[PDB]
Amino acid sequence: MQFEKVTYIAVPQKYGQKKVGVEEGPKFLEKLGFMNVLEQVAKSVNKKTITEPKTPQELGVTNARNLNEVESVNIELRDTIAKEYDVNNLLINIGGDHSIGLGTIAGVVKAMKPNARVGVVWFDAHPDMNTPENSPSGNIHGMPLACAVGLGPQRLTSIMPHYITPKDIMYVGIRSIDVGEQFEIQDKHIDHFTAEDVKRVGMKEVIEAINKKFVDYDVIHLSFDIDGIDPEFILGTGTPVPKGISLEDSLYFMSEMGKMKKLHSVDIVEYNPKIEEEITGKNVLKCISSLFGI
Amino acid sequence: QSMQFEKVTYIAVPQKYGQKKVGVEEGPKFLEKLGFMNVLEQVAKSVNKKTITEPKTPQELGVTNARNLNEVESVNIELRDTIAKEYDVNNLLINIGGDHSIGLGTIAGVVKAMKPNARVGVVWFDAHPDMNTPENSPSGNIHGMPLACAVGLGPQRLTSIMPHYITPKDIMYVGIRSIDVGEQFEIQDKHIDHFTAEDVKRVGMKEVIEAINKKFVDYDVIHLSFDIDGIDPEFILGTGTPVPKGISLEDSLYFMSEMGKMKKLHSVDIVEYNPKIEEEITGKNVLKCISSLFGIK
Ligand SMILES: CCC[C@H](N)C(=O)O
Numbered sequence: 258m259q260f261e262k263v264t265y266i267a268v269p270q271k272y273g274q275k276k277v278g279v280e281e282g283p284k285f286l287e288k289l290g291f292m293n294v295l296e297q298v299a300k301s302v303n304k305k306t307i308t309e310p311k312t313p314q315e316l317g318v319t320n321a322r323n324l325n326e327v328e329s330v331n332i333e334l335r336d337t338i339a340k341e342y343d344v345n346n347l348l349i350n351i352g353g354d355h356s357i358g359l360g361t362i363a364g365v366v367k368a369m370k371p372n373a374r375v376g377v378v379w380f381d382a383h384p385d386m387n388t389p390e391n392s393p394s395g396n397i398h399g400m401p402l403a404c405a406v407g408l409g410p411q412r413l414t415s416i417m418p419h420y421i422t423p424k425d426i427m428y429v430g431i432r433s434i435d436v437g438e439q440f441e442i443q444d445k446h447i448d449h450f451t452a453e454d455v456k457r458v459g460m461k462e463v464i465e466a467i468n469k470k471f472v473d474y475d476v477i478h479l480s481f482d483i484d485g486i487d488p489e490f491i492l493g494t495g496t497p498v499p500k501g502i503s504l505e506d507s508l509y510f511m512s513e514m515g516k517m518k519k520l521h522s523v524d525i526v527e528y529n530p531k532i533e534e535e536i537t538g539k540n541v542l543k544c545i546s547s548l549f550g551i
Numbered sequence: 552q553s554m555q556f557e558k559v560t561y562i563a564v565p566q567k568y569g570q571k572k573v574g575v576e577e578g579p580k581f582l583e584k585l586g587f588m589n590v591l592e593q594v595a596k597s598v599n600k601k602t603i604t605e606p607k608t609p610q611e612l613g614v615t616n617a618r619n620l621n622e623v624e625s626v627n628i629e630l631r632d633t634i635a636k637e638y639d640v641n642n643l644l645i646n647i648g649g650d651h652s653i654g655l656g657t658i659a660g661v662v663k664a665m666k667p668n669a670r671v672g673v674v675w676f677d678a679h680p681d682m683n684t685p686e687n688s689p690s691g692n693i694h695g696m697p698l699a700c701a702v703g704l705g706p707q708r709l710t711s712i713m714p715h716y717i718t719p720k721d722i723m724y725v726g727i728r729s730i731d732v733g734e735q736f737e738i739q740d741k742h743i744d745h746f747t748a749e750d751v752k753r754v755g756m757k758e759v760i761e762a763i764n765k766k767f768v769d770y771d772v773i774h775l776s777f778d779i780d781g782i783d784p785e786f787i788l789g790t791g792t793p794v795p796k797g798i799s800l801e802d803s804l805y806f807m808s809e810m811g812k813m814k815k816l817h818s819v820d821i822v823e824y825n826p827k828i829e830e831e832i833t834g835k836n837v838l839k840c841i842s843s844l845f846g847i848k
Pocket residue numbers: 383385387392393394395396398399400435496
C-alpha cells in the first residue's frame with residue numbers, strides 16, 4: 258500500500274560463499290529501477306549501507322569460511338535493524354548471500370521485547386540449517402537458520418539476543434536438503450512445503466497454513482532466497498536447483514505475504530548479477546513489486 | 552572518494568511543468584539507473600531520500616505568460632518545506648530535477664532553514680540567467696524565471712514562496728551566454744557578478760573559483776544551482792535548451808571539485824537532465840560532475 262517510510266538496507270556480503278558478485282546485488286537492483294519501485298510505496302526511503310569487508314576470500318578447505326567477515330557484517334546488520342525496525346513501516350534488506358539472514362533475524366529479535374513471538378518464513382531451495390561440523394561446503398550461507406536456533410559456533414550463535422525455536426519457522430520451496438537438515442526438519446517437526454508440495458496443493462494452501470501458524474505471533478519476518486524460484490526464471494544465483502517454484506506461484510506468494518498485517522521486514526538475497534544480470538534482476542523486481550502490490 | 556559525511560539528504564524533484572518538453576521529470580529515475588545511489592554510497596552510509604510529489608495534471612499548451620503556475624507553485628512549496636526540515640550545515644543535501652523552475656523552491660528552502668538574518672549566497676551555473684518575468688518572457692516557461700522570483704520580480708504566487716527575498720548581490724553566475732533583454736538589463740543595472748562562458752575561457756576556472764571565495768567570505772552559506780546546459784553540448788546533449796560555446800567538461804569537473812571544497816556549501820541542485828532527449832552520454836557525464844563535487848575520481 259503506502260507507508261510513511263521504507264527503510265532500505267543494502268548488505269554487500271559475499272563472504273558466506275565463494276563466488277564473486279553477490280555483493281553487487283543491491284547496486285544492480287538499483288540500476289534496474291529498485292528505487293523507483295520504492296517510490297510507489299513511500300515518499301521517504303531511508304537507505305543504510307552495511308560496510309563491505311575488503312579482505313581476501315578464504316578459498317581453501319575449511320568448515321567455516323571467512324567467519325570474521327560474516328560475524329562483523331551480521332553484527333552491524335543486527336544493530337542497524339535494531340534501531341530502524343518499525344511495526345508501522347517496512348524494512349527491506351537486500352543482499353548479498355544468505356549468511357545475512359542470521360543478522361537479519363537477530364535484528365528483529367533485538368528490536369522487540371524479550372517475550373515477543375517472532376515468526377520466520379524462509380523461501381529457499383535450501384533449509385540453510387547446516388553447521389560447520391556437517392556442512393559439505395564450509396560456506397556459512399548454508400548455516401544461518403541453524404545459528405538462529407542455537408546450533409553453530411559461539412561467535413555466530415551469540416549474535417542472537419536470544420534464540421528462535423524450530424517451531425517459529427515455515428519453509429517454502431525447499432528441495433535440496435543435506436542429511437543434517439533432514440534430521441532437524443524431521444526431529445523438530447519443522448513446518449514446510451517442499452517445491453513438489455507447492456505443486457500438489459497450490460500456493461493458496463501455503464498462504465493459509467502461514468496465516469494459521471502465526472495467528473498468535475507478534476510479527477513475521479520473510480527471508481526470500483531467489484533460488485527458491487525455478488532456474489528457468491532465476492539464473493543469476495550461486496546455487497540454482499531445478500524443479501523450483503514457478504514465477505507465477507512466486508508472485509502470488511509475494512502478493513499474499515504483502516497483505517499480512519504482521520509482516521514488517523523482508524530480505525531479498527542471493528542475487529548474483531555477475532552470473533546473470535537482466536533476466537534475473539527484472540524477475541527479482543517483479544517479486545518485490547508483487548510484495549508491495551504494484 | 553575524499554568527502555565523507557554522516558548522511559546525504561537526496562531529494563528527487565520530478566518536475567516538467569516549468570517548460571514544455573516531456574522527459575525532464577525522469578531525470579532522477581535515469582540517474583538512479585546509471586548508478587547515482589552507488590555514487591552517494593562513496594560519501595555516506597546513510598542516504599535519506601525524499602520524493603517531491605509529481606503533479607499529474609494537463610500541460611498548459613497554448614500561449615500564455617506563465618504556464619502551469621499551479622504545478623510550479625505546489626512543487627516549489629513542498630520542496631521549500633522539505634528542504635527547510637532536512638537542511639544541515641554538517642551534512643549535504645542534493646536536489647535532482649526536473650526543470651530549473653525548482654530553483655525557486657530550492658533557494659526558498661535554504662533561506663527558510665536559516666535564521667531570518669542569514670546571508671545566503673547563490674552560485675548559478677547555467678547557459679541562461681533565468682531572470683525573466685512573465686511580462687518579458689519570450690516563452691512563458693517558468694524555468695526561465697526562478698531567480699527573478701527569488702529576488703522579488705515575478706507573480707505574487709511565486710515570489711511569496713520566499714520567506715524573504717535574496718538580492719542581486721547574492722548571485723554569482725557562471726557560464727551564461729544565452730541572455731534575453733530583461734536579463735541583460737538586470738545584470739547591468741544591478742551589477743550582478745558573472746562569468747560568461749567566454750570569460751571562463753579568457754581568465755580560466757581557477758580565477759572563477761577565487762572570485763567566488765572572495766565574494767562569499769562574509770556569507771553564512773552558499774547554495775549551488777547547477778543547470779547541466781551550462782556545459783557545452785558536445786558533452787550534454789540530453790537537455791531541453793542546449794546552447795553552443797559552453798563550458799568544457801574538463802572545466803566543469805574542476806569547477807565542481809573546487810565548489811565541493813568550500814566549507815560554506817551544504818546544498819546542490821542538479822537540473823534539466825532530460826533522458827528522453829538523450830540518455831547515456833549525458834547521464835554519465837552528469838554523474839562525473841556529481842562525482843567531482845564529492846572528490847571522487
Ligand atoms: C546454500 C547451501 C548449500 C549447502 N547446503 C551447503 O551447506 O553448502
